[PDB]
Amino acid sequence: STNLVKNKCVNFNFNGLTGTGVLTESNKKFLPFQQFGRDIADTTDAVRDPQTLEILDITPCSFGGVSVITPGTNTSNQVAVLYQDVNCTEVPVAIH
């Protein structure tokens, strides 16, 4: 299957992995016989594709909590919405 990197979060299976992360270009030094790397807590952060020495980072898809600002019911009925802790170029692609 063709490889789409950084286009969007995409669940995947390179060789025997759960995946479910967005992919990005990495520059970490990496030994030849090695296959993938776990940063901390045995969580896999970087993997290497068989088609090249190209290594790929893995980042979880963004999530957060939505909060509502309000000046009180009796005064007015406007509100404001704050999507916490997230770069917001994906706000229209929020399911909840």
Partner: peptide
């Protein structure tokens, strides 16, 4: 304060403090 600030070296989220 500068010296004190350098000496101290350090589904989950971390909220930011309200006063910087």
């Amino acid at each position: 304060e500068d010296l004190l600030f350098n000496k101290v070296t350090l589904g989950l989220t971390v909220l930011p403090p309200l006063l910087t």
